[PDB]
């Protein structure tokens, strides 16, 4: 009988395929987020006219999804695989099929469906249209054309594929729990991340300091606005990501009413919109090197 592919091998295969498809192997951004959309390689890079082809793994910390290690598919931290291509090639679905076949999955022996899902992230002002790709009834991918990122119209169009690595690994390894997942060289995902899952769950639910979260968010927003005032895009964006994560922890603590949830979203949305303003202004202020390189690569 065959050996199932470890998380190690799955990630390597995806990275190799996308490298063969002109993607760049960037690193997960060193800040706490909730999805791979919030890395600047996804978020900031999708706006402006500069082309961008990237692929990277990304830890997604969603405080509300932590389950103390009982529920083996919904976790405080999972791993997504973000592929972001700009402009989107018209053969993108062909490449996605080639990649899933490279994982040793023949569509002839399995059922694959593209189910329409109107992708939105309101806090970041990100809008996108695409499918949730279901394999044998289980959602394994989120495949989206971006339309309005940070409130701005996307020109050219950006494709993104978000693989849920935990669900994909559990499927290919045909395991019913993520804690039996072979990460690499046979080492169990449970034996590594079982303690982090429980510890982060207890922190996010029954131990975090409420006023600390409030003051931290407000000060982070003040600082992000200050950086926008002078024009420091990346530090302000980091402070915005920290603001969003603090908001997520507040919602998991039971601190944000539904009322002020919209207000916090408004503040974060304006933060992202102003960041987009400053970023595009500075990039057009620098003559757009990636356009020059696209001209060089075509010739």
């Amino acid at each position: 009988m065959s050996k199932k592919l470890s998380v190690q091998e799955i990630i390597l295969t995806l990275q190799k395929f996308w490298s063969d498809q002109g993607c760049m192997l960037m690193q997960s951004y060193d800040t706490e987020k909730g999805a791979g959309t919030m890395s600047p390689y996804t978020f900031l890079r999708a706006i402006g006219p500069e082309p961008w082809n990237a692929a990277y793994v990304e830890p997604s910390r969603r405080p509300a999804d932590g389950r103390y290690g009982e529920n083996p598919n919904r976790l405080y931290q999972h791993h997504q695989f973000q592929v972001v291509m700009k402009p989107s090639p018209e053969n993108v679905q062909d490449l996605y099929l080639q990649s899933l076949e490279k994982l040793g999955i023949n569509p002839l022996e399995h059922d694959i469906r593209f189910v329409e899902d109107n992708w939105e992230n309101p806090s970041m002002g990100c809008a996108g249209v695409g499918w949730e790709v279901w394999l044998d009834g289980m959602e394994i991918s989120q495949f989206t054309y971006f339309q309005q990122v940070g409130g701005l119209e996307v020109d050219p169009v950006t494709s993104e594929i978000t693989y849920g690595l935990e669900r994909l690994s559990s499927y290919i390894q045909d395991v019913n729990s993520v804690f039996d997942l072979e990460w690499g060289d046979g080492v169990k995902y449970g034996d590594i991340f079982l303690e982090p899952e429980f510890e982060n769950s207890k922190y996010a639910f029954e131990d975090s300091n409420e006023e600390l979260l409030l003051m931290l968010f407000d000060e982070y927003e003040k600082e992000a606005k200050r950086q926008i005032k002078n024009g420091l895009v990346h530090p302000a964006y980091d402070y915005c990501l920290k603001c969003s994560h603090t908001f997520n922890l507040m919602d998991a603590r039971g601190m944000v009413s539904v009322t002020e949830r919209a207000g916090y979203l408004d503040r974060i949305r304006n933060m992202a919109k102003s960041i987009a303003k400053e970023f595009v202004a500075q990039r057009e202020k620098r003559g757009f090197p990636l356009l020059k390189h696209a001209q060089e690569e075509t010739k």
Partner: protein
């Protein structure tokens, strides 16, 4: 020759809920083109796959309708002399039209023979009109969703991948921004491949080779046939929903129905939860038995063949069993907590900022429901059970079943309250205060549930207009129109005296009595509710074929009672024929039009007999007095109508003899009092001036 055109736009995969309307719109756009481009054809068959939209035009007449213009000229006596020759005028009229005298035909017009020169001003051939119409057809389409490609921002349902445009075997070349149109179609993303098409008719056949069924009817027929085959093979009684079949039909291209099993332990959980999970979320067809008992099996369809079927079945089993284990945990944890916990936690859930929390909503609805049982005439037990339900009816919102399945609200409340040693009728009332589910949908089968739903939705609408959250013509963020529609439906189905005229005072009054935290401008804000609710009743009446004028008559009543309008409308839509009825309507229209311009105080209508000039005034006054001795809100509508109407000879003799428009102010005022009393009595049924007499 009559040609066959084939146009398929093959796309990325489309959502089912728009695949059929999209192809229907494609038909409509093509038809609009063909008529405006004056084309005739035999038929248009449609084909839809989750990846392509196709029309097939059989028998296309090869031209746009040529302008065969028929222009008349001089008469035959003037166009031709005695010698039968053409006069020079028969030469000039033909020469101007671009013809000769040969093309003249004599056609009779009212006993005079005129020349006619049919100038065949030819029209257009297929290719060029096709180019223009393809462009304009593509531009206009509208969809729930939006699209964007690289440098070509344009809103669409799905990105366009390939285009096939074939005229029987001839290629219609047309390129869209970068994507050309060719004779190449794409088969199944998994089993098939691209393929060329020889003729526009062959389309369907070729897809059958690459194993794609373009015919939607054939797909559904085969799907249902295999479902029935499995039902008769495993002795199952599958109960299939049709909307689910719509989704599945517009989600696949080559079907293979299959069944999986799951563990019998999941039968411990409610059948409603099982059906909701499978049907609504995993899109499975639950299996019942002969006695209609639900079996722990499910059926779905793969967009594939019968190869490695059990592996797909196992994947679906894994997903379903995961959801089912989640459901079992939610079920058995919701059972652990007592009801008081949910009731108290309901205080935190704010129903809205300027309104307050849902707990306060339960308090207000509790008072409203008790008052409704009072006015409606309900039993001691019914009132006590209703009070308990209104105490607890919204608890199920803070259960894990509602956290996972928002649809199952109310139903779970019934389930748990029955489990928690509560009254099953109370739980059913909790279940029923959500009804109706739509404009076309079920209504509560019980009086307690009906009263609860009415009180809840009344509180909702009153509060939402008390905070100024009035919906606009096309925007209703809270579906409050549906709540009012349900109010009307429940009241009609139950038939209760429900005047929206005094409900303001009732609600405020009782809030003053019990809890005045909801008591400041809440009857000033129920006055526009008195201005509301009328449009919803009118909308239902226009749904029930009723003449707009009958509506506007029964509506403009002073009482503003819903059931009173129901019965009066039933009476008046019933009389389309009574002989002495039309005369009554005409007289009443004249009277009401004359009374509309009376500028007297409508609180001082005491009639002085000393200001009478004739005797018909006295007889009408006596009739008015003896009718007022009976006329009260305490008579059925036809009694009032008949009693008022029957004295029309008196009314006609009054207007014939007594002239009402008097140049003496007090005499005219006396006439206006005697007439405005009758106008007030009539306006109970409403404004009969909205009757057209024919």
């Amino acid at each position: 020759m009559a040609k066959t055109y084939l146009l398929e736009i093959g796309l990325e995969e489309m959502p089912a809920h728009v695949v059929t309307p999209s192809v229907l719109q494609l038909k409509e756009r093509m038809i609009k083109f063909l008529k405006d481009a004056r084309l005739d054809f035999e038929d248009v068959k449609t084909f839809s796959t989750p990846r392509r939209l196709t029309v097939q035009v059989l028998g296309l007449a090869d031209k746009q309708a040529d302008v065969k213009k028929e222009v008349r000229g001089p008469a035959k006596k003037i166009a031709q002399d005695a010698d039968g020759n053409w006069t020079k005028a028969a030469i000039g009229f033909s020469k101007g039209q671009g013809a000769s005298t040969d093309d003249i035909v004599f056609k009779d017009v009212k006993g005079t023979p005129y020349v006619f020169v049919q100038t065949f001003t030819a029209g257009k051939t297929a290719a060029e009109v096709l180019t223009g119409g393809i462009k304009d057809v593509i531009t206009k389409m509208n969809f729930p969703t939006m699209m964007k490609w690289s440098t070509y921002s344009f809103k669409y349902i799905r990105p366009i991948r390939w285009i096939v445009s074939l005229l029987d075997d001839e290629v219609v070349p047309v390129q869209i921004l970068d994507v050309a149109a060719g004779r190449v179609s794409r088969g199944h993303r998994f089993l098939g491949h691209d393929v060329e098409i020889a003729t526009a008719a062959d389309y369907e056949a070729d897809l059958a080779s690459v194993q794609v069924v373009a015919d939607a009817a054939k797909r559904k027929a085969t799907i249902r046939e295999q479902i029935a085959a499995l039902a008769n093979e495993r002795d199952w009684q599958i109960k299939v929903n049709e909307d689910l079949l719509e989704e599945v039909n517009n989600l696949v291209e080559y079907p293979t129905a299959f069944a999986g099993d799951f563990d019998t332990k999941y039968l411990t959980i409610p059948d409603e939860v099982l059906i909701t999970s499978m049907r609504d979320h995993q899109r499975f067809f639950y299996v019942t038995d002969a006695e209609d008992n639900l079996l722990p099996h499910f059926v779905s369809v793969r967009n594939g063949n019968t190869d490695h079927l059990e592996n797909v079945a196992l994947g679906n089993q894994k997903v379903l069993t995961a959801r089912l284990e989640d459901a079992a945990f939610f079920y058995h944890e919701d059972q652990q907590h007592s009801i008081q916990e949910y009731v108290e936690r309901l205080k935190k859930v704010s129903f809205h900022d300027k309104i307050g929390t849902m707990y306060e909503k339960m308090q207000r609805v509790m008072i409203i429901s008790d008052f409704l049982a009072d006015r409606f005439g309900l039993t001691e037990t019914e009132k006590n059970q209703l009070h308990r339900a209104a105490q607890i009816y919204k608890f199920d919102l803070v259960t894990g079943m509602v956290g996972e399945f928002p649809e199952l609200q109310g139903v779970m409340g019934d389930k748990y309250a029955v489990l928690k040693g509560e009254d099953p009728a109370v739980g059913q009332a909790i279940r029923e205060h959500y009804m109706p589910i739509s404009a076309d949908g079920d209504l509560p089968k019980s009086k307690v549930g009906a009263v609860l739903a009415i009180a809840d939705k009344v509180d909702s609408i009153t509060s939402f207009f008390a905070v100024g959250l009035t919906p606009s013509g096309s925007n209703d963020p809270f579906a409050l129109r549906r709540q009012a529609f349900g109010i009307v439906r429940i009241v009609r189905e139950q038939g209760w005296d429900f005047p929206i005229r005094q409900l303001e005072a009732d609600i405020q009054k009782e809030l003053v009595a019990h809890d005045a935290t909801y008591n400041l401008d809440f009857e000033k804000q129920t006055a526009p509710v008195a201005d509301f609710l009328t449009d919803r009743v009118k909308q239902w009446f226009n749904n029930r074929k009723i003449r707009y004028d009958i509506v506007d008559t029964v509506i403009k009543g002073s009482r503003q009672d819903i059931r009173e309008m129901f019965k009066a409308a039933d009476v008046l839509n019933a009389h389309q024929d009574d002989p002495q009825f039309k005369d009554t309507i005409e007289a009443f229209t004249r009277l009401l039009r004359i009374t509309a311009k009376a500028k007297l105080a409508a609180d001082d209508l005491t009639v002085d007999p000393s200001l009478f000039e004739n005797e018909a005034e006295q007889h009408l006054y006596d009739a008015v007095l003896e009718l007022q001795k009976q006329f009260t809100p305490a008579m059925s509508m036809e009694d009032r109508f008949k009693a008022l109407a029957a004295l029309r000879p008196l009314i006609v003799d009054y207007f014939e003899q007594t002239m009402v428009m008097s140049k003496d102010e007090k005499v005219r005022d006396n006439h206006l009092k005697q007439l405005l009393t009758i106008a007030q009595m009539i306006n109970v049924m409403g404004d009969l001036n909205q009757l057209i007499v024919k």
